[PDB]
Swiss-Prot record, chain B:
Catalyzes the attachment of serine to tRNA(Ser). Is also able to aminoacylate tRNA(Sec) with serine, to form the misacylated tRNA L-seryl-tRNA(Sec), which will be further converted into selenocysteinyl-tRNA(Sec). This is Serine--tRNA ligase. Belongs to the class-II aminoacyl-tRNA synthetase family. Type-1 seryl-tRNA synthetase subfamily. It is found in: Cytoplasm. It is an enzyme of class 6 (ligase). Pfam families: Seryl_tRNA_N, tRNA-synt_2b. Its EC number is 6.1.1.11. L-serine binds at residues 166-168, 220, 320. One of its GO terms (cellular component) is cytosol. Pathway: Aminoacyl-tRNA biosynthesis; selenocysteinyl-tRNA(Sec) biosynthesis; L-seryl-tRNA(Sec) from L-serine and tRNA(Sec): step 1/1. It catalyses: tRNA(Ser) + L-serine + ATP = L-seryl-tRNA(Ser) + AMP + diphosphate + H(+); tRNA(Sec) + L-serine + ATP = L-seryl-tRNA(Sec) + AMP + diphosphate + H(+). Consists of two distinct domains, a catalytic core and a N-terminal extension that is involved in tRNA binding.
Length: 368, 359
């Protein structure tokens, strides 16, 4: 949520910034500001974020690598996965329903190897601490990171357990951002212990409400996908620099795997609810002849910290202030598997195993 | 479910075998447990289970033994209070080197079963539909043991899902409705998944630590085999789970469960129990079961001889190799040192970047 003092003493400045991201603040209602409307207001954009309406106004910052030229017919990841009996979408319908998958054999092992390579890289070289977290969370946690009240329909919710004294309303996590960031809920942190850098590998569950029609086949858009998440808790004055550092950590994954990509900064109209600034990384997908989002890295400013009342304290004076939080994908594992399968395919239908993954796959050089 | 021909032609024989496991046989067919195998000892509860063998000797300590919760807290590696804040009781947050050892355990097990024991690795959904739960027997009788999700408003009729209590459920259902060539058997599958259990009627049982949780990781083994091979396959599969404990240098004992302590769907179960120093006893770390044709009948999973065209029901088997949270308990307590550090078992060091000690 936003600083209530800014809504008091500068309703004009605030309503204008929010207008740049397409949100009209009822000034009349703004004075009143009752109920939970304060919890439905998105974060203020940083000054340097380009103004725009939708994704067509996003701005490319840089890119790395050149898409490979194919002298044979380019096959998509579903065709490749099914001809090696490694992806089975029909079995997933039988077990559960649509937008789930079963992976088998060498392709399942490559999916596992990707998550292990990412986790090792961030913990051994980038200074992140590894965490194993619950995949179910409670209402206070979802309010803390902003998923509630506005995005309840994006989540899977559990029913109450048939028991005496059980009244648990849990939701499945849509991203490890939720549990990791809430680890500092209600804490007051010594400024000398900052930054806190955490990573986790979790499944992620999303209803994908109102996304039907788009990406109907394949691994791009699923109800369940694996993701290695990075989160940082930092001093307010360090957060813009930490965003550059964290985005670089995600780029390093793509570079070591040899995947061409581009980095874009989102405009005001395309940013997510809680971010004040976001870089997306988009990886080359040969069969779609374009770049597709593979990571989103955001500075959240003090927006989550205020809901969570997570504060830091200086060593000189005992005064406290809100920390800043950041999160970013490093990376979404399912979409990385898509990019590896299509970019490393060979003319005979085999898939070359990227060099850095071979130690995680018992030396295997080719799939198939 | 049981063979309906058998209930017709031999109600006496059937009602007697079911009596052994404490079930009085007067959609209702789906509430009847499996028939115990002849070699299973008759008994009422876990006091009548029978020890079969042991391997290794518990280590003798010349200092006071610390439990895994104390050890987890001194290394800032297990944090139960943070889990209550995020979610509720019976959850845990693991951090740092303890989290990495938990991950390394699952990778070592998966690599062993796929590289040496001939199992095929699978990534599966952690939500399943009701037909799948009926197939492996969790429905209709054990709905209360599960977390259920509310239907998605845009898939309102087809999204009554539940979180899996074990990868047995999705893996075994991969052959639902199939006819398999006998030459393609046995089918050997493994998976590493989280497991979710309501733990109803268990308030008080192991209230401290990692032994009993709402969420835990497990590496599961499943086999689909010809009906005449299933008792041999149980011995093979139980030995796959034993090899994990042996390579980790963990003392254990193997018991066979009596009729009265067996699970709903098993006809024969070996449990493996691992030595837990701070409890001065063995605790269950794996359960390996022959399920006979009980699940195959609900699923109509069949096999065909190449000679003729007749089909018959396959047999199915499942076993833990292993439950990862409880293995972490065993490794932490059996390898602790006097200063509180924890020796990393030799076989895990390649999965922990060469680390020799925690702490
Ligand atoms: N339904 C989905 N199926 C597969 N992958 C997805 C799905 N939704 C998102 N992703 C992947 O996960 C990444 C992170 O998702 S995000 O919502 O944009 N951002 C977050 O969740 C933040 N916590 C940063 O990780 C996306 O960039 C995309 O690569
Ligand atoms: N609530 C729990 N918390 C932690 N570990 C558990 C819990 N319940 C069971 N386990 C572990 O998981 C193992 C397998 O559980 S089981 O119900 O007995 N059997 C199965 O699920 C079969 N699919 C074989 O794996 C147990 O032997 C025990 O080691
Ligand atoms: Mg995004
Ligand atoms: Mg049991």
């Amino acid at each position: 949520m936003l600083d209530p003092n800014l809504l008091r003493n500068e309703p004009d400045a605030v309503a204008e910034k929010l207008a740049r991201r397409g949100f009209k603040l009822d000034v009349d209602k703004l004075g009143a500001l009752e109920g939970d409307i304060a919890l439905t207001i998105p974060n203020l954009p940083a000054d340097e974020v380009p103004v725009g309406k939708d994704e067509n106004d996003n701005v490319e910052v840089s890119r790395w690598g050149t898409p490979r030229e194919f002298d044979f017919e380019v096959r998509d990841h579903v065709t490749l996965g099914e001809m090696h009996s490694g992806l089975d979408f029909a079995a997933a319908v039988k077990l559960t329903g649509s937008r789930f998958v079963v992976m088998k054999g060498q392709i399942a092992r490559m999916h596992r190897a990707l998550s292990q390579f990412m986790l090792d890289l961030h913990t051994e070289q980038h200074g992140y601490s590894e965490n194993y977290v619950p995949y179910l969370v409670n209402q206070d946690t979802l309010y803390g990171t902003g998923q509630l009240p506005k995005f309840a329909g994006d989540l899977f919710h559990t029913r109450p357990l048939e028991e005496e004294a059980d009244t648990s309303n849990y939701a499945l996590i849509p991203t490890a951002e939720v549990p990791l960031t809430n680890l500092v809920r209600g804490e007051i942190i010594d400024e000398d212990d900052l930054p806190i850098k955490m990573t986790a590998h979790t499944p992620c569950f999303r209803s994908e409400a109102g996304s039907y029609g788009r990406d109907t086949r394949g691994l791009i858009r699923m109800h369940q996908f694996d993701k290695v998440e990075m989160v940082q808790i930092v001093r307010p004055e360090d957060s813009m620099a930490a965003l550059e550092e964290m985005t670089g950590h995600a780029e390093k994954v793509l570079q070591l795997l040899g995947l061409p990509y581009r980095k874009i900064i989102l405009c005001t109209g395309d940013m997510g609810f809680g971010a004040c600034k976001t870089y997306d990384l988009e990886v080359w997908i040969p069969a779609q002849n374009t770049y597709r989002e593979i990571s989103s890295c955001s500075n959240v400013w003090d927006f989550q910290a205020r809901r969570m009342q997570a504060r830091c304290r200086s060593k000189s004076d005992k005064k406290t202030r809100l920390v800043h939080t950041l999160n970013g994908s490093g990376l979404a594992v399912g979409r990385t598997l898509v990019a590896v399968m299509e970019n490393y395919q060979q003319a005979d239908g085999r898939i070359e195993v990227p060099e850095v993954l071979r130690p995680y796959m018992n030396g295997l050089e080719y799939i198939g």
